Amino acid sequence: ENKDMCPICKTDRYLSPDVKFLVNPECYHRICESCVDRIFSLGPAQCPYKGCDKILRKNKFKTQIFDDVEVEKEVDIRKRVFNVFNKTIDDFNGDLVEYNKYLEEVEDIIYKLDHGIDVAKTEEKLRTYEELNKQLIM
C-alpha cells in the first residue's frame, strides 16, 4: 500500500499517487509508472517488485488500483471465468436453482482460482475453461 506500490517507488501514496500501479493480468503486482513503463516498453520483463521474477508483460496490463489484491486476483479470476463460462446454461429456459447452482459452480472455480488450494482442481478448472472455450467456438 503506502509502503509497497512499486519495485522502485514502493512508497507512493504520499509521493503524489496519481501515476498508475498496473497489475499485468499476469503480475498481480503494484508497479509504479516508472517501472511498469520501463518494462512493457522494453517488453515483457519481470517487474522487480520485492524480489519478483514474474514477467511484467508488454502492454497487456489491466487496472487494479489497490483493490486488495486478494480481491484483484479474485476479481481478475472471476471475470475471465465468468467470461469463459459466459452464459453456460443460466437462462436457457429460466431455471433459478440449476443456473444459480451452475452460478454457484461458476464462481466456485473463481473462489478456487482466487485460492488455488493445492492446485490440481484449478488445473481442472482450466480444462473446463478450454472445454467452455471449445464449446463457445462450436
Binding site: 522502485i8 517507488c9 512508497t11 504520499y14 509521493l15
Partner: protein, 73 residues
C-alpha cells in the same frame, strides 16, 4: 570512439571518413594506430539510484511539507 594511445576521443563518423578500403578498423590520424569504442551508460544507472535514494530520503520531508501546505503554517 577514442584512441587509447594518444588518448584523443573519436566517433563513428570522423573515423569512417578515415577507414581504408584495405582495412576493417579505424586507424588513428595522429598515431596511425587503430581505435577503440568509448562510453558507458553505467553512469545513467548510477544516476537512477541517486534519484531513487533522494526520493526515499525526501518522501517524509514532502509528506510534512504538503501536510504543512494545508494552512500555510
Amino acid at each position: 570512439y577514442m584512441c587509447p594511445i594518444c588518448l584523443t576521443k573519436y566517433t563513428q563518423l570522423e573515423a569512417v571518413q578515415l577507414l581504408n578500403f584495405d582495412r576493417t578498423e579505424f586507424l588513428c590520424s595522429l598515431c596511425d594506430e587503430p581505435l577503440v569504442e568509448d562510453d558507458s551508460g553505467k553512469k545513467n544507472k548510477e544516476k537512477q539510484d541517486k534519484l531513487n535514494r533522494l526520493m526515499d530520503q525526501i518522501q517524509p520531508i514532502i509528506d510534512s511539507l504538503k501536510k504543512i501546505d494545508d494552512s500555510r503554517i
